[PDB]
Design a protein around this ligand. Structure first.
Ligand code: CHL
Ligand code: CHL
Ligand code: CHL
Ligand code: CLA
Ligand code: CLA
Ligand code: CLA
Ligand code: CLA
Ligand code: CLA
Ligand code: CLA
Ligand SMILES: CC(/C=C/C=C(C)/C=C/[C@@]12O[C@]1(C)C[C@@H](O)CC2(C)C)=C\C=C\C=C(C)\C=C\C=C(C)\C=C\[C@@]12O[C@]1(C)C[C@@H](O)CC2(C)C
Lengths: 212, 217, 213, 230
């Protein structure tokens, strides 16, 4: 039932009709029919954006710090694996940092949720009432102060597709960090160097068979 | 029409519009226990209370157990916690239990009287202004009001799905607790210890080799 | 008019010749009631198909043992497999009744309610579990080559072959048990001994079958 | 109307000479169902094309590399890429190629487009005969060439089976085994080395080791249905 002009995750396949192509990154992939219900699909679309944008920040926050250390840049946190950052000594105890984090994230997340329930109802600054986001925004794409450079005024449809594509790739990358670190016990870029050193004897088959 | 046993004859008393409006109706009543409509209404309340208590109880055994294994917490086995807690307690278990019966008895009595006369606990003047919030909703077993702080039940388009999830997880939790009791006697270890032992060697560590469940073999 | 098991005797009324392998043999009238006959038709086919698998499995492994490829005798295979491979017998027994219980129960409730297993309740599969006839499932899973979906006349011929080979296998399996009890040897040890001296090595000289001899 | 596998016989009803290489041979009636025949027709071409390349490949290996037995070529070959490196590349490349071929069979015309370069597409074609880039040169009539392909293909399928059983019975490559036949034709046939009569069965011994040690593991190497050998 899906339009044949739309791109497909499996060329030639007959895909569900409810994925009509409005959402970005709509390739008709839903073999388990999780998004069949329109009410749940609405929630999943936002959840995909949220997990996708945190994954992109997280992946960039795990490679660049490791890349800089390998280059030679020196700073107190250099050379610390992403899975050992918790034990590192910061200016404040980790417990107090977590407490501040939840209070700050309670404010912004409840503001974001208010918009999802009633879009356009959280666009106004509560203190400096003059400030406000433009009235045309949609859930998940605030704009206004969140888009200071005005990129959203261009080809928005292409930009949203680029965002979700990079986001889906970042989500897989973070899942790779968990699996690779758990099985190899080393940082992701060290794993890449091992693979490039001898690609033909460093596959997951080679590595896991040895550990078997 | 989803059934617990595809191709079997669904009981007639579970195919009525009233019965099919119950959450989790898969046509399962081989003993005909719910054949009487009045009894089915009472047993539906019993299933919800067992579901919700089992879910809270099993979560109070499984989550602390998993965290204890991970080292986040240090909680004893569910079957030893009562003794450990009472030693460091401020009251003997007899006085602790008696207070529990008084407090539980009071709220259970109010729920009991609501089953017999739905909405009757909203009788003006009975409670100190709070009776208005004790009328419940149009469905027995779903009080709402102060019992639903986030107001998730107000979403009509999601109401049927919420109820099905509750009964499905509730039925699963009840079987999990029955599994904990059986596995405690069969193996003499904790539920997470049983899970780890099975995963270590699934084909040699199970109930067919515990020496209790299958005596004929 | 059709050939019968006892030439000259008319076939019974309830055996009208439509079923495969119908030779009018029911001297005890066990299948007189039509609903009982349908159940028995499936029972004969399930027995026959299990016996055909058992006869072929016993024969093949017996050949391997005879030509010295290291196979055990069918009456010793169970012990050798569990001990050699370190398999818990009760665990294997439980898995067997899970898998057979699932397949048998679905077959059971298709007999009680034909086509009831094709509603999509099992993982969404619909047509593969509809069934074609009593005791003849058909479909893409049970008949992947669609030999029941081609020539109707050819299909009826295969039904006659299946039941006849099935009855022969059931008799053969009874022979394996009786011959092992009488001789204590494997099926092809018995065959080899008979061929060496047919006149003097047979059931009449084994010291068991004819006790008065 | 057409030559038959058994001259003087009547072909089955479901075979009418439409397909290339149709000589009315289907004694068991496996192709009576139309849907089955479409799958079997595709399968026969794939088996035949694989067998033709393999038979040609084995023959050239023996001539070019007479010192290596094709049956042992799996373990004797040593390359830097290693065992699992080679297998990983083969798995992914074959998975892509086979799924695309498979999709055309299910839904013809749906995988004729080049995924990467949008200007390249396969012209419409029959299932199993993808023209275009796959067929830059067609020497003559397709109908005649399709018959030639399947006839040579059915011969190569039997040839490969002959290579396997000859190798297991003689331990020699196809050409070496042939020269053994020519030296003593009356004492080298399968009849000359095997026989079964009531009371005695004589079979040749499997000339392939029961197991092979390969880079620290043991690979079983059983003869095919040895217990059933004549
Ligand atoms: C996306 C979320 C997220 C993820 C995936 C992780 C993942 C991880 N954190 Mg991290 N954290 C995350 C958010 C946060 N962490 C922390 C604070 C910490 C701390 C303080 C520690 C970790 C550690 C760990 C690791 C736990 C496994 C381990 O080694 O156990 C075994 C545990 C240990 C060997 C640690 C023993 C000493 C430790 C001081 C004991 C107390 C630890 C706390 C109970 C941690 C509580 C974390 C909670 C609040 C998220 C793992 C790599 C641990 C680590 O890096 O270990 C090498 C660690 O010590 N995290 C905060 C608060 C700012 C977070 C806020 O969002
Ligand atoms: C068609 C069914 C069937 C038959 C006729 C046999 C028959 C036999 N099995 Mg076998 N088995 C069968 C099914 C199975 N067996 C096994 C697993 C084994 C094992 C592990 C062993 C046998 C053994 C035996 C032999 C001795 C039986 C015995 O101890 O009786 C005495 C017990 C009873 C009469 C109770 C029967 C209750 C029902 C005998 C030849 C034994 C053998 O080969 O010894 C040399 C042996 O050790 N069988 C499995 C896998 C779970 C089966 C599954 O269906
Ligand atoms: C058409 C495929 C094919 C065929 C017919 C053969 C045939 C043979 N190989 Mg060769 N090989 C084949 C592919 C490959 N081989 C090898 C690597 C080897 C080695 C290392 C050895 C052989 C050996 C042998 C011989 C005996 C093997 C045996 O009895 O194993 C018994 C059967 C098994 C051990 C396993 C059977 C597996 C199953 C039939 C198929 C599994 C399919 C996969 C799960 C699919 C996914 C993977 C992808 C790539 C398709 C025999 C001549 C042995 C030899 O030379 O002996 C003298 C030997 O030592 N082969 C590779 C890796 C590059 C292959 C890749 O395709
Ligand atoms: C999801 C986003 C995310 C999160 C949760 C973290 C979390 C963390 N980062 Mg990372 N980081 C991220 C993205 C993220 N980073 C990105 C996008 C970059 C740019 C490439 C970096 C670059 C970076 C560096 C260079 C370092 C960290 C470090 C840290 C730790 C201390 C944070 C701090 O002191 O902030 C302070 C807050 C403000 C200045 C505001 C902490 C575990 C430090 C660390 O691991 O030390 C051991 C560290 O040295 N991060
Ligand atoms: C985002 C994609 C991505 C990438 C680029 C890599 C890259 C690498 N992985 Mg990782 N991995 C990923 C995801 C990824 N992984 C995920 C999701 C998991 C969880 C299952 C793992 C689990 C894992 C293990 C357990 C191991 C590696 C290892 C490796 C190395 C290659 C050898 C190997 O066995 O790979 C196997 C990798 C996979 C089977 C991942 C398949 C799934 C991804 C998403 C496929 C994407 C394909 C697509 C065409 C894009 C690829 C190219 C693009 C990024 C430019 C290399 C450093 C090995 C290593 O560290 O060697 C030193 C190793 O042992 N990975
Ligand atoms: C059916 C529900 C149920 C029951 C009957 C029990 C019973 C028990 N629990 Mg368990 N527990 C449950 C659910 C339950 N739990 C759940 C859902 C969780 C969360 C996963 C836990 C987590 C938990 C932990 C971590 C511990 C217990 C412990 C105990 C024991 C002491 C109880 C006590 O002192 O309470 C006193 C509590 C109150 C009077 C009121 C609640 C006080 C808390 C702190 C308020 C939390 C507010 C919330 C965050 C908002 C006792 C055997 C303790 C134990 O076994 O000690 C040996 C123990 O360490 N429970
Ligand atoms: C219902 C019939 C039946 C039964 C109960 C058995 C039972 C057995 N067979 Mg037999 N077999 C059968 C039919 C049967 N076979 C048929 C029809 C054939 C083909 C003619 C064979 C060919 C065969 C061989 C070649 C071998 C056995 C072996 C075995 C044993 C191990 C089975 C195993 O590990 O399976 C697990 C296997 C799978 C799940 C793969 C599918 C076991 C005693 C083995 C034996 O003798 O071990 C000592 C053995 O080597 N069987
Ligand atoms: C079924 C196909 C097949 C397979 C699986 C093999 C397998 C093998 N061959 Mg053989 N071979 C084949 C066909 C095949 N051959 C054909 C058709 C020919 C005739 C040209 C040969 C000629 C040949 C020779 C002369 C030799 C082998 C050797 C080998 C071995 C080492 C291969 C190697 O080092 O590759 C390394 C691979 C490369 C350097 C790159 C190869 C790239 C090719 C040319 C691309 C082909 C594309 C084509 C479209 C594929 C069609 C596949 C299929 C549909 C037919 C290995 C056992 C060697 C041997 O015996 O070693 C002990 C050896 O000396 N083969
Ligand atoms: C690595 C495991 C293994 C080994 C060492 C053997 C060994 C043997 N098998 Mg068995 N076999 C196995 C697995 C194995 N088999 C499996 C998984 C199957 C099911 C596909 C069979 C099916 C099978 C049959 C049908 C027959 C044998 C037979 C034999 C014997 C002669 C070789 C032969 O014809 O093999 C043929 C085996 C294969 C081609 C499968 C190899 C899979 C790797 C020999 C004792 C023969 C015999 O004498 O039986 C009594 C025989 O007729 N096997
Ligand atoms: C309430 C419940 C469990 C409650 C558990 C609690 C509070 C546990 C609390 C604690 O653990 C903590 C947290 C911490 C520990 O340190 C201490 C304790 C105090 C131990 C289980 C119910 C468990 C209930 C179960 C298992 C009921 C099963 C019923 C079945 C199968 C009925 C089937 C049928 O009736 C039908 C539906 C239809 C008929 O036609 C046919 C038949 C077959 C009769």
């Amino acid at each position: 039932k899906r339009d044949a002009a739309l791109p497909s995750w499996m060329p030639g396949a007959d895909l569900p009709g409810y994925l009509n192509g409005t959402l970005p990154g709509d390739f008709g992939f839903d073999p388990l029919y999780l998004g069949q219900d329109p009410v749940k699909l609405k929630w999943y679309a936002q959840a995909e954006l949220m997990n996708a944008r945190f994954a992109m920040l997280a992946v960039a926050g795990i490679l660049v710090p490791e890349l800089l250390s390998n280059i030679g840049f020196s700073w107190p946190g250099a050379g610390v694996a992403w899975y050992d950052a918790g034990k590192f000594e910061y200016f404040a105890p980790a417990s107090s940092l977590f407490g501040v984090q939840m209070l700050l994230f309670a404010w912004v997340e409840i503001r974001r949720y208010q918009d999802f329930v009633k879009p356009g109802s959280a666009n106004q600054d509560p203190i400096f009432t003059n400030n406000k986001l433009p009235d045309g925004n949609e859930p998940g794409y605030p704009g206004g102060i969140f888009d200071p450079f005005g990129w959203s005024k261009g080809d928005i449809k292409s930009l949203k597709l680029k965002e979700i594509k990079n986001g889906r790739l970042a989500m897989l990358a973070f899942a790779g960090f968990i699996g690779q670190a758990y099985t190899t016990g080393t940082t992701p870029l060290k794993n890449l160097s091992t693979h490039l050193a001898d690609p033909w004897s460093t596959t997951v088959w080679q590595n896991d068979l040895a550990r078997l | 029409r989803q059934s617990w046993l595809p191709g079997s004859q669904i009981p007639a008393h579970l195919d009525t519009p009233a019965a099919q409006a119950l959450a989790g109706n898969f046509g399962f009543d081989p003993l005909g226990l719910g054949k009487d409509p009045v009894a089915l209404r009472w047993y539906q309340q019993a299933e919800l209370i067992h579901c919700r208590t089992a879910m809270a109880g099993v979560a109070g055994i499984l989550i602390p157990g998993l965290l204890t294994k991970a080292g986040a917490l240090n909680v004893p086995e569910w079957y030893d916690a009562g003794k450990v807690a009472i030693e460091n307690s401020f009251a003997p278990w007899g006085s602790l239990l008696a207070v529990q019966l008084f407090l539980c008895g009071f709220v259970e009595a109010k729920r009991w009287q609501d089953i017999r006369k739905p909405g009757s606990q909203g009788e003006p003047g009975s409670f100190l202004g709070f009776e208005a919030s004790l009328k419940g909703t149009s469905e027995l077993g779903y009080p709402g009001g102060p019992f639903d702080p986030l107001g998730l039940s107000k979403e009509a388009d999601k109401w049927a799905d919420w109820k099905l999830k509750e009964v499905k997880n509730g039925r699963l939790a009840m079987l999990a607790f029955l599994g904990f009791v059986a596995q405690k006697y069969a193996t003499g270890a904790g539920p997470v210890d049983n899970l780890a032992a099975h995963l270590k060697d699934p084909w040699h560590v199970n109930y067919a080799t515990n020496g209790v469940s299958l005596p004929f073999l | 008019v059709r050939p019968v098991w006892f030439p000259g005797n008319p076939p019974p009324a309830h055996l009208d010749g439509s079923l495969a392998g119908d030779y009018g043999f029911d001297p005890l009238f066990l299948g007189q009631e039509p609903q009982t006959l349908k159940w028995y038709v499936q029972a004969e086919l399930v027995h026959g198909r299990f016996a055909m698998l058992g006869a072929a499995g016993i024969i093949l492994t017996s050949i391997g043992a005879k030509v010295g490829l290291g196979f055990p005798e069918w009456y010793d295979a169970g012990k050798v497999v569990v001990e050699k491979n370190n398999i818990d017998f009760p665990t294997l027994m439980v898995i067997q009744f899970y898998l057979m219980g699932w397949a048998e129960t679905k077959r059971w409730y298709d007999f009680k309610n034909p086509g009831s297993q094709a509603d999509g309740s099992f993982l969404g599969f619909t047509e593969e579990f509809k069934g074609l006839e009593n005791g003849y499932p058909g479909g893409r899973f049970f008949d992947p080559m669609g030999l029941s979906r081609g020539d109707a006349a050819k299909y009826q011929e295969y039904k006659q072959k299946e039941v006849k080979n099935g009855r022969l296998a059931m008799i053969a399996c009874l022979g394996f048990a009786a011959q092992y009890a009488a001789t204590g040897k494997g099926p092809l040890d018995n065959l080899a001994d008979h061929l060496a001296d047919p006149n003097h090595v047979n059931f009449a000289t084994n010291g068991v079958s004819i006790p008065i001899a | 109307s057409r030559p038959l596998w058994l001259p003087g016989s009547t072909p089955p009803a479901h075979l009418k000479g439409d397909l290339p290489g149709d000589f009315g041979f289907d004694p068991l009636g496996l192709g009576a169902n139309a849907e089955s025949l479409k799958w079997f027709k595709e399968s026969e071409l794939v088996h035949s094309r694989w067998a033709m390349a393999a038979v040609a490949g084995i023959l050239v290996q023996e001539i070019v590399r007479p010192d290596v037995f094709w049956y042992n070529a799996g373990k004797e070959v040593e390359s830097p890429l290693g065992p699992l490196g080679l297998l990983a590349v083969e798995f992914f490349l074959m998975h892509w190629v086979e799924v695309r071929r498979w999709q055309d069979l299910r839904k013809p015309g749906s995988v004729d487009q080049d995924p990467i370069f949008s200007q390249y597409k396969l012209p419409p074609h029959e299932v199993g005969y993808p023209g275009g880039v796959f067929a830059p040169f067609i020497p003559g009539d397709l109908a005649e060439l399709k018959v030639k392909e399947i006839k040579n293909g059915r011969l190569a399928m039997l040839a490969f089976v002959g290579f396997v059983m000859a190798a297991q019975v003689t331990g020699k490559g196809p050409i070496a085994a042939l020269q053994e036949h020519l030296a003593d034709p009356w004492g080298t046939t399968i009849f000359s080395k095997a026989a079964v009569v009531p009371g005695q069965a004589v079979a040749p011994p499997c000339k392939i080791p029961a197991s092979v040690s390969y880079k620290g593991i043991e690979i079983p190497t059983p003869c095919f249905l040895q217990g059933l050998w004549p």
